[PDB]
Ligand binder design. Structure first.
Ligand SMILES: CCCCC/C=C\C/C=C\CCCCCCCC(=O)O
Ligand SMILES: CCCCC/C=C\C/C=C\CCCCCCCC(=O)O
Lengths: 131, 131
């Protein structure tokens, strides 16, 4: 888990407006969210992992234990059930709500944190680097 | 093991001339070795790890499997028996020769590869970063 610890700044985004659309995100929300360029701050305190996201759009924060399901209000205000695991060296988050799901894979790849989000066939990719 | 993969350049050295002395390294060898500023290249091919070190002083290379003892000729021409493990998230190498030993711990710490070498109480520290 310590490989993910640090402050990370957005470096690139691809197909994100398409992903948010499949999730159900509204037009005006999709617009300011794409313009954000947020900083992802990941920390660990004992067995508790915290993933914070900061921008002018929104500031969210989840705190969780690996493999323990938790309630989460997403940045676009969906109420979901979330489970995060360590799986092939990546942090894999599955979010479930209203019979649907999406998967948010966070992995290391050289000096980059690579976040890929999938929702029944629509994939977006966001690369972060160390701020 | 993929956290260690890449090219790494020397960034800092501390107490290295003292460590080499306790190991048994000669004067003239100690002098050019301290001036080197080498690049450490770590790669993996299946279950085989390769750690290469390149400089004007010397170019060495070890290839090994985790937890399997192997013969190694060091940069200063000691013939040793070496075992490398993954232990607390660090690559830990123990080198044995002539009833002696030294330990070479390689660990990640933010964006740095931190190599610490110990020989009965004399410790040196070398920090590398991604070239
Ligand atoms: C770090 C938060 C990025 C800003 C998110 C802004 C709006 C998000 C709204 C709906 C989609 C949810 C985001 C899911 C992917 C995590 C963000 C990332 O893949 O990086
Ligand atoms: C990467 C090789 C560095 C150059 C080494 C030059 C001379 C070494 C001679 C005797 C001491 C052996 C080095 C043991 C520590 C590994 C090097 C490092 O801690 O970084």
């Amino acid at each position: 888990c310590d490989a993910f610890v640090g402050t990370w700044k957005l470096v690139s985004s691809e197909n994100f407006d398409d992903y948010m659309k499949e999730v159900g995100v509204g037009f005006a929300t999709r617009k300011v969210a794409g313009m954000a360029k947020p900083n992802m701050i990941i920390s660990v305190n004992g067995d508790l992992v915290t993933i914070r996201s900061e921008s002018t759009f929104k500031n969210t924060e989840i705190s969780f234990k690996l493999g323990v399901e938790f309630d989460e209000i997403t940045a676009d205000d969906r109420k979901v059930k979330s489970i995060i695991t360590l799986d092939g060296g990546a942090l894999v988050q599955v979010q479930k709500w209203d019979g649907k799901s999406t998967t948010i894979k966070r992995k290391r790849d050289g000096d980059k944190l690579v976040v890929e989000c999938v929702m029944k066939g629509v994939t977006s990719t966001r690369v972060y680097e160390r701020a």
